[PDB]
Amino acid sequence: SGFRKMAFPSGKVEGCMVQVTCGTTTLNGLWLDDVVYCPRHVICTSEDMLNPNYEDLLIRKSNHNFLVQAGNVQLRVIGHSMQNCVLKLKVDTANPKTPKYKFVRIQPGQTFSVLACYNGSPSGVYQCAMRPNFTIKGSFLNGSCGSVGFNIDYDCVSFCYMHHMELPTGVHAGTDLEGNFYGPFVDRQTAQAAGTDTTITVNVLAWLYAAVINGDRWFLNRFTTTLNDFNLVAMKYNYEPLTQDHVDILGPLSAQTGIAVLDMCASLKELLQNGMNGRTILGSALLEDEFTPFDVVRQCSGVTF
Amino acid sequence: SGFRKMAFPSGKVEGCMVQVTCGTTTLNGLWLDDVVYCPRHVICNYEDLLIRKSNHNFLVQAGNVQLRVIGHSMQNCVLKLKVDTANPKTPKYKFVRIQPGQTFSVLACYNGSPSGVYQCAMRPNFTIKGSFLNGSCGSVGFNIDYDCVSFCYMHHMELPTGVHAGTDLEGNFYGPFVDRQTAQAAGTDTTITVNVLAWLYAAVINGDRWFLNRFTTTLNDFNLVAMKYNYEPLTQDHVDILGPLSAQTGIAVLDMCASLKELLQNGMNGRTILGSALLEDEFTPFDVVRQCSGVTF
Numbered sequence A: 001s002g003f004r005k006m007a008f009p010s011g012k013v014e015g016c017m018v019q020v021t022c023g024t025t026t027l028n029g030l031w032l033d034d035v036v037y038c039p040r041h042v043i044c045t046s047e048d049m050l051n052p053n054y055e056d057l058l059i060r061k062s063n064h065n066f067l068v069q070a071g072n073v074q075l076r077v078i079g080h081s082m083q084n085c086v087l088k089l090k091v092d093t094a095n096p097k098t099p100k101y102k103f104v105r106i107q108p109g110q111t112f113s114v115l116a117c118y119n120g121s122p123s124g125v126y127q128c129a130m131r132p133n134f135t136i137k138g139s140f141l142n143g144s145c146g147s148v149g150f151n152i153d154y155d156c157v158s159f160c161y162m163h164h165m166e167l168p169t170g171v172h173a174g175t176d177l178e179g180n181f182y183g184p185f186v187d188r189q190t191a192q193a194a195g196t197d198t199t200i201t202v203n204v205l206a207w208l209y210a211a212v213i214n215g216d217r218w219f220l221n222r223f224t225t226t227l228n229d230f231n232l233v234a235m236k237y238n239y240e241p242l243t244q245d246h247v248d249i250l251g252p253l254s255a256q257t258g259i260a261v262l263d264m265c266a267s268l269k270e271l272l273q274n275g276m277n278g279r280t281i282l283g284s285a286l287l288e289d290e291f292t293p294f295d296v297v298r299q300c301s302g303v304t305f
Numbered sequence B: 001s002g003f004r005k006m007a008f009p010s011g012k013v014e015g016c017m018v019q020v021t022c023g024t025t026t027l028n029g030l031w032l033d034d035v036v037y038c039p040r041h042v043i044c045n046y047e048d049l050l051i052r053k054s055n056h057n058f059l060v061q062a063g064n065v066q067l068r069v070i071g072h073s074m075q076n077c078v079l080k081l082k083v084d085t086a087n088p089k090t091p092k093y094k095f096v097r098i099q100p101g102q103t104f105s106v107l108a109c110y111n112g113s114p115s116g117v118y119q120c121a122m123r124p125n126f127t128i129k130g131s132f133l134n135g136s137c138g139s140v141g142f143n144i145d146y147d148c149v150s151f152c153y154m155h156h157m158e159l160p161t162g163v164h165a166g167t168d169l170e171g172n173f174y175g176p177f178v179d180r181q182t183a184q185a186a187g188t189d190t191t192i193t194v195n196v197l198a199w200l201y202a203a204v205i206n207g208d209r210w211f212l213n214r215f216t217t218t219l220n221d222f223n224l225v226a227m228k229y230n231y232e233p234l235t236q237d238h239v240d241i242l243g244p245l246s247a248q249t250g251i252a253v254l255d256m257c258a259s260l261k262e263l264l265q266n267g268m269n270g271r272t273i274l275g276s277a278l279l280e281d282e283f284t285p286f287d288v289v290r291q292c293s294g295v296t297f
Ligand SMILES: O=C1N(c2cncc3ccccc23)CC[C@]12CCOc1ccc(Cl)cc12
Pocket: A041, A049, A140, A141, A142, A143, A144, A145, A164, A165, A166, A167, A186, A187, A188, A189, A190, B001
């Protein structure tokens, strides 16, 4: 019993964190095999950030301008290349702690663990979700750039995020490990803002199924809805549209609890209209959208209370 | 910017998790140096049950390797299995007993394999609101200070309300609990006042000030209000501990108490604080200072 925002154990990622220094800028890098991956803005000064020409800044650098530190050891850079918004530094030592890994690009609504780091040293781990507006509501201070997001289903680490910047509203933007940004963001200090955010409907439904599995049914009702009528109501509360894909994905949780997806959609509609009336669901007074259907299945018991 | 429920990096603890099997029971053990620590209920009058066991009855598995048990002894509600191999991954560590209100990271484990990490607090009723299934017994709670792991909790059981009970690493239970199947229940719980105040200071640091007001209160008047809303009493030590956050934000502790009193008597009125519609009590003053400064390990 219980339901917590749970992160993956971070040990496999901690053994990959390094500090990358170029001139006066210091940030974090990910050392996998003989390559260190880090945000390309490590080659920039504060002035450069308005309209940096990264190709022009990079051509002026040599291998020995990049200082890479792994623990108390200095790694030697023997090559460098840029791939989108990530810089790849070839080093002369393969990381003996390199886990089994993949680079995966995730979709909005997907969750992942973040290992927040400063000076190549991990400070904390937390769970978060890629918002529908492609930002993440993280906890990052200056010096956290290069900190990574990941999942560890089985013993393979799937790296999905690398931290690059903080937007004016306090939310965060970054790239996959191939350097492609999530959303319409650029690694430039130009006026950029997060788009209007929405609630991840499929995740709220998954969390309502987690509440039923753990023994709570106060929010259920005798009604059902069509998918179209549910979406017309959902859009009015800034909830993401629910697709047939989402309904299919919720199939296993529906079979475990005996509650049809469109019947759970009817409880959600009613919760949006009424609020909670002093009650909580899994210890929360708000509808939680940072647990996916897969996260609920992984954390919750297979036997409904 | 941002404020998340953050756990310590778990790597130093992951390298200590093992699977302990005795007969039909399988649970988790903590391998430090040449000793594996685990709940004594892995055997099932514990001295009578233990005397009937030999070293070879305990199967200990570290990854894909079988460790050989060469001795066994009981210390309170923890069983200590002497093994023939010292853990090469043993970090610098201490066994510490924490107080209610203190927070720690839990590395939830099943079959000696870590599955997740989360942050939690020792409630005033000595239970923890964890996330544990059958097979999680022996999972541990810890903090990290510099390079030293301070182990403070070992999981033993789930109470009927879905909350969890356990011991320190010397086998002493937190709370009036016993390791056996009998009628046991969590006592009435209270809110950790010093932690709610720390979280209100974290909200101010992150730019959330709607709840601030021009008023102040005495510690006595605040405690008369706090006792009415099932909040733990606030002591002069809590006021002293909140001193740094009070100096950083310019809001006196008793000035923040007047804000908390207004929130308790009137609610949030449709508003949130750090994305929450409830008053959060699982961040200590130290957790707020650490997360708003980026301390590393
Ligand atoms: O957002 C940025 N940084 C931060 C990153 N994450 C958290 C932070 C918290 C507090 C202050 C800064 C933070 C560091 C680099 C910067 C600042 C300058 O403007 C840009 C422009 C583009 C890019 Cl890719 C990065 C940046």
